[PDB]
Design a protein around this nucleic acid. Structure first.
Ligand code: MG
Ligand code: MG
Ligand code: MG
Ligand code: MG
Lengths: 134, 11, 69, 100, 120, 36, 197, 143, 49, 38, 219, 62
RNA sequence: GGAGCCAGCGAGUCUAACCUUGGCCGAGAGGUCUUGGUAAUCUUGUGAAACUCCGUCGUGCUGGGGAUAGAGCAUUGUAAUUAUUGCUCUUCAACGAGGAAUUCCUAGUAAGCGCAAGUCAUCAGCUUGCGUUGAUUACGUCCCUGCCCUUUC
């Protein structure tokens, strides 16, 4: 009875991002190479090749933990201080991440708003969790 | 290079 | 100060020679003793543990502790 | 070949021991993020220092910087009265003095 | 019904509710295993009662902890207090008072905060 | 040993925009007293 | 031990006995100097230093505090580090590891020996100055303060982190070598007291 | 220093002002310090880098003089440097690499070498030979 | 007015600079509706607010 | 321009003189309005 | 006539006072709070670091304290002073003007903390007696006849000027020396309850936007 | 070598300077021998102090 | 630079346009289509910050510092090319722990971090409240200083 919650967050996110890169079906927008991920950030991501996949893994994991989540909550979650007044994250990247995760079938549009973890995505993430626990 | 009894420049 | 920023053949061999002798191995030790950059020390330590010339005791992102194999 | 301790790029002296991004930042008109983008477009790995750069890498960097729009650098990304005010202040001051 | 008890632990604004029922040693916090609680450095602070009285007493029970309020340190203290209190309530109300009595002296000998709330 | 000359001013003053701002503060204070 | 929630083997070894960070045992550690025995507290083992106890209520509640917790508390000073006790605990963990590395002796024994050695045994007071004996509690307090201060100042603008420099200060103090800042200050204070003796 | 612009108080140039301050203008002579600094700074021992100078002002201000400095030879420019130093508490080189003159925290004792011999110049004290004195002193110490 | 916090509010177009606001502190003011108010303090930025 | 509220009083030398004359007058006859124990 | 809230205990128990400031007090406000402590014989200063108003009053009430003084500042300048009486009020809020601390006096010396004589003048309206009754009972009862310390509250157009003086009786006249501090305090809220209860009924509140405010007198 | 002496009595009304306490200590080596000393930190009874010189007798430090 | 990730005090739209979830567009700022809430119900678990893990950097006024300045992309009015408040890029100064001196401070106290409302005085990067992390030393003395009490001596 393995689940996402039985695996460490960092271990699961790294492993699932690695699988997403290996699969190669996750659509990555063209502007990932020129974006900062937030207004508060001073520099763009250092790991240019794989930061988008890691964010997709983060979004998938949180969607697993919480039944429904929207772009606003993820924007707040991934945002940090720039007195510094906790500027929110970038909406576009999170929206594209959600769209890509839905294209893979990991998530789907939710009634009542937000996104739901697809049963297919549920089993998929469970599979990565089982592999990581090994 | 200052040497001996030379004084610092005056501007 | 001037710290070596590139790996050369003499430095490569000199790394492989003394590091087994040291009781305590860390990024600071390599910087202080070998006059090598911190980044090269981190990269070297990742290599050296791979060949098993040193063993890891406690790993932390900021601080890594190693000892002679 | 031999590591280049110093290099001449766009009429500027850049140290070899610094990373490419933070060495190219020295050039006027080039900051940290602009140098990062120039490197990424030039397909140069950022982990390399400035001295390991081959001549072709440097020439490609030159043409990135000199022709940004030609290489899809974003447009958004790329780059008496005081005396009158003083006189008005003096008029204010003298009138206020006359009041007191 | 299935045997079970409730207990509460609190520190600052952090509060933890512990459900202790008969079972097979399933310990979970916030819907996750006790092993994955964060921050890592304070994990052994969460483990305290487990290793003080031993896991044999736990092999026959399941504990579920839900924590809210406060910060990470306060939440960890709430977790350990709730685990202790739920343990002792269970061993009172379906185990001989003698077992309860050793559990109490063990906990009070190590740290009184596990049982008695420390309100500043 | 190396020799370096000291750098100093012939006359020490403890640019004009700062001077303009300084007069504003005095004018702000002086006017407020008269209003009171 | 098989449990529905998986538990590491090291956790069962810790069931066997309480060990600081599950790596250091309190059984064999002993204070070498008799006079400090009832002010340096090591008998009650603890997994982690963080205790959130109340030791400022009464004048001599501090002595009952575990010495490692006192070291962690003293490690956080200078404003920019105030209130970040988790960082202090992590640093002390790394320091104990480094001590065990450089010398195979148990790190807690090193801490105890260093505190015993570097405690100023005789000090001065203004009247001019006159020599005065030092209470054991003040000896412990000044020892911990000197060790922490020297370790911090050593690595203030150096590549060395606080962990390694603290370990170096601790081992040098335990040896009694003059290389440690705290031993230098102790000897200087004792010399000044002897002059006004 | 005193605002008239701030000027280094002098025994001759300023007499009425120091009378207002109530200080005896006999003890108002900075040129004596200037000549001592001049003869001291230009000594070959300074050129050998074996001499370092401290100044304790009558007010209680301790000034550290880097051996590398080249104070002006004329007194007028010397006065200008003191007033800049006393107000700004430090003097920077023309090349802007080191602070030649810097005010430091009293006492002098902490700044001095750990092992060092201390002596004063006393007219009433027994007459000694400077060369014989320095020879008989130890080497690791300073004077 | 341009920014309102219940009773408190920030106003524009009385004055061209904080010079002017300096005298009219404590001055009696009211709206067309008849709500009475007071000029409390001049905003440093922008001028006239 | 009309004022909405009373201005903040200023402690000029005359005001201090009047206040201290008041205090001296009160104390001369020991006219103290102080709480008395019951 | 003494108020009902004080009528039971007027002159029977010495007042117990806690002087405190707002969260993160500036250095000057801490100095000012220290001065207020020295003003009242039975005042104790308490650092308000992270204390909570329900927690503060509950702890204060349990300890048996009579009155609580909370000071507010703006850039190290005292601006307001509120006095709350236990167990059920009143709470009176004041605004301080022209505050001058003794720290601004060089070579000032040390105060005397004998039970001081009190002077209240120009309090003629009903509200004026209420203010006098509030201020009087902060001090201990029955000051010594030869006590050298006198505290005065002078009401001048609702602006209560507060001064502290020490006197010596000479053959021809009385000479008073000011000890400070100087400050003018004006009442702008008086409520039937403790400062914690924000819903306590308001006995009186200062109307500032009424047209007659510029000339109206209340004390 | 430094002797060890256990505190038996914490003297009061000695006129000692602030920050210093006059105490009476009995040597561990010889219980009968007892000496008055001055202590610079928080001191109580039944604690042990290290003495460099067992010969000096404490005097009031004003 | 990523990832983990947790509070409490409160506010919020009728003859109106307040807090705003969700969807889409936008590099960001923001725009746009809807939706819940006159509120322990919806915004909101206010997924606050510091903090912790994995990485880059590396004692270099350096990837600390962000004062000053230029050019752009937008909001708010208003009819001016007027300012206003945000974002992007570039520019990258003084400062390397601070003299004589001086002020405050004893437990959830010093210190660090953020979140909310501007509710008739005061306040506008300022006031107040709220929450998060959380110490060292002392808790003894009248010796110095200062202020008192008693001698209904
Ligand atoms: Mg404040
Ligand atoms: Mg504070
Ligand atoms: Mg704050
Ligand atoms: Mg006391």
């Amino acid at each position: 009875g393995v689940s996402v919650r039985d695996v460490a967050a960092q271990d699961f996110i790294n492993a699932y991002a690695s699988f997403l890169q290996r699969q190669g079906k996750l659509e990555v927008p063209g502007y990932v190479d020129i974006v900062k991920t937030s207004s508060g950030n001073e520099m763009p991501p250092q790991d240019a090749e794989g930061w988008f996949y890691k964010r997709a893994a983060s979004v998938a994991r949180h969607i697993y933990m919480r039944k429904q989540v929207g772009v606003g909550k993820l924007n707040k979650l991934y945002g940090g201080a720039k007195p510094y007044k906790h500027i929110d994250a970038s909406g576009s990247i999170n929206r594209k991440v959600l769209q890509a995760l839905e294209k893979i079938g990991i998530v789907e549009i939710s009634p009542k708003g937000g996104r739901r973890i697809s049963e297919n995505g549920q089993r998929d993430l469970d599979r990565i969790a089982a592999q990581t626990l090994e | 290079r200052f040497k001996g009894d030379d004084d610092i420049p005056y501007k | 100060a001037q710290h070596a920023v590139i790996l050369d053949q003499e430095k490569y061999d000199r790394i492989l020679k003394e590091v087994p002798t040291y009781r305590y191995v860390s990024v600071s030790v390599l910087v202080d003793r070998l006059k090598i950059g911190g980044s090269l020390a981190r990269i070297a330590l990742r290599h050296l543990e791979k060949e098993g010339i040193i063993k890891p005791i406690s790993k932390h992102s900021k601080q890594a502790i190693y000892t002679r194999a | 070949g031999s590591f280049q301790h110093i290099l001449r790029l766009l009429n500027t002296n850049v140290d070899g021991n610094i990373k490419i991004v933070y060495a190219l930042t020295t050039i006027k008109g080039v900051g940290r993020r602009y140098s990062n983008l120039v490197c990424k477009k030039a397909d140069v790995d950022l982990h390399k220092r400035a001295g390991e750069l081959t001549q072709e890498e440097l020439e490609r960097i030159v043409q990135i910087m000199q022709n940004p729009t030609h290489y899809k650098i974003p447009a958004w990304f790329l780059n008496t009265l005081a005396n009158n005010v003083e006189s008005k202040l003096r008029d204010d001051l003298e009138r206020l003095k006359k009041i007191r | 019904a299935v045997p079970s008890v409730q207990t509460f632990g609190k520190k600052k604004s952090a509060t933890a509710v512990a459900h202790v029922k008969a079972g097979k040693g399933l310990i979970k916090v916030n819907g996750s295993p006790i092993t994955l609680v964060e921050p890592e450095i304070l994990r052994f602070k969460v483990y305290e009662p487990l290793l003080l009285v031993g896991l044999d007493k736990f092999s026959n029970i399941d504990i579920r902890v839900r924590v809210t309020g406060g910060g990470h340190v306060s939440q960890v203290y709430a977790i350990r207090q709730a685990i202790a209190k739920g343990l002792v309530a269970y061993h009172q109300k379906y185990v001989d008072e003698q077992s309860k009595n050793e559990l109490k002296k063990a906990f009070t000998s190590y740290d009184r905060t596990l049982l008695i709330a420390d309100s500043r | 040993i190396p020799t370096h000359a000291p750098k100093y001013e012939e006359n020490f003053n403890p640019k004009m925009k700062a001077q303009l701002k300084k007069e504003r503060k005095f004018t702000m204070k002086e006017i407020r007293k008269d209003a009171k | 031990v098989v449990l529905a929630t998986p538990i590491p083997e090291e956790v069962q070894q810790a069931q066997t006995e309480i060990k600081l960070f599950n790596k250091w045992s309190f059984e064999e550690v002993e204070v070498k100097d008799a006079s400090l025995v009832d002010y340096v507290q090591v008998r009650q083992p603890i997994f982690v230093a963080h205790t959130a106890g109340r030791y400022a209520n009464k004048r001599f509640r501090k002595a009952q505090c575990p010495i490692i917790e006192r070291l962690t508390n003293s490690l956080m000073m200078n404003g920019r580090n105030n209130g970040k006790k988790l960082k202090a605990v992590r640093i002390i963990k790394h320091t104990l590891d480094i001590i065990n590395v450089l010398t195979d002796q148990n790190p807690i024994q090193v801490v105890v020996d260093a505190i015993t050695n570097t405690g100023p045994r005789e000090d001065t007071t203004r009247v001019r100055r006159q020599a005065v004996d030092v209470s054991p509690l003040r000896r412990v307090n000044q020892a911990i303060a000197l060790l922490t201060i020297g370790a911090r100042e050593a690595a203030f603008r150096n590549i060395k982190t606080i962990a390694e420099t603290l370990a170096e200060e601790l081992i040098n103090a335990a040896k009694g070598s003059s290389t440690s800042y705290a031993i230098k200050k102790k000897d200087e204070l004792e010399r000044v007291a002897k002059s006004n003796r | 220093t005193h605002k008239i612009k701030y000027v280094l108080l002098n025994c001759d140039d300023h007499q009425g002002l120091l009378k207002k301050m109530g200080r005896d203008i006999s003890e108002a002579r900075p040129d004596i310090t200037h000549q001592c600094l001049l003869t001291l700074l230009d000594s070959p021992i300074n050129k050998a880098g074996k001499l370092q100078v401290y100044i304790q002002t009558s007010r209680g201000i301790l000034i550290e003089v880097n051996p590398t400095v080249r104070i002006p030879r004329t007194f007028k420019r010397f006065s200008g440097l003191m007033v800049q130093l006393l107000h700004k508490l430090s003097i920077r080189s023309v090349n802007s690499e080191e602070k030649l003159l810097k005010v430091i925290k009293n006492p002098i004792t902490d700044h001095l070498p750990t092992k060092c011999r201390k002596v004063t110049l006393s007219f009433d004290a027994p007459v000694i030979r400077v060369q014989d004195y320095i020879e008989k002193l130890d080497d690791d110490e300073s004077i | 007015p341009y920014k309102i916090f219940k009773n408190t509010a920030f106003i524009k177009d009385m004055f061209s600079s904080a010079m002017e606001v300096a005298r009219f502190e404590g001055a009696q003011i009211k709206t067309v509706s008849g709500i009475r108010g007071e000029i409390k303090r001049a905003l440093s930025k922008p001028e006239g607010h | 321009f009309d004022r909405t509220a009373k201005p903040v009083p200023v402690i000029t030398s005359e005001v201090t003189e009047s206040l201290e004359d008041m205090i001296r007058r009160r104390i001369q006859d020991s006219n103290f309005d102080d709480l008395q124990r019951r | 006539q003494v108020d009902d809230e004080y009528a039971a205990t007027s002159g029977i128990m010495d007042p117990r006072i806690i002087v405190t400031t707002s969260r993160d007090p500036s250095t000057r406000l801490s100095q000012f709070a220290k001065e207020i402590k020295l003003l009242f014989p039975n005042a104790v200063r308490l650092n308000r670091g992270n204390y909570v108003m329900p927690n503060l009053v509950d702890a204060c009430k349990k300890s048996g304290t009579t009155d609580l003084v909370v000071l507010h500042e703006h850039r190290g300048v005292p601006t307001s002073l509120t006095i709350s009486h236990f167990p059920h009020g009143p709470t009176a809020q004041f605004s301080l003007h022209n505050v001058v601390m003794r720290h601004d006096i060089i070579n000032a010396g040390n105060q005397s903390e004998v039970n001081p004589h009190l002077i209240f003048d120009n309090f003629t309206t009903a509200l004026g007696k209420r203010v006098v009754c509030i201020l009087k009972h902060l001090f201990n009862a029955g000051p010594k006849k030869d006590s050298e310390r006198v505290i005065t509250f002078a009401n001048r157009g609702d602006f209560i000027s507060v001064r502290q003086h020490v006197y010596v009786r000479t053959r021809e006249g009385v000479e008073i020396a000011e000890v400070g501090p100087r400050f003018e305090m004006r009442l702008f809220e008086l409520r039937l309850g403790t400062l914690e209860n924000k819903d306590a009924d308001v006995e009186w509140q200062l109307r500032r936007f009424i047209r007659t405010a510029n000339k109206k007198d209340y004390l | 070598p430094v002797t060890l002496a256990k505190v038996i009595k914490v003297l009061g009304r000695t006129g000692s300077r602030g920050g210093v306490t006059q105490v009476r200590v009995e040597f561990l080596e010889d219980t009968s021998r007892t000496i008055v000393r001055n202590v610079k930190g928080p001191v109580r009874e039944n604690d042990i102090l290290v003495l460099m010189e067992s010969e000096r007798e404490a005097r009031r430090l004003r």
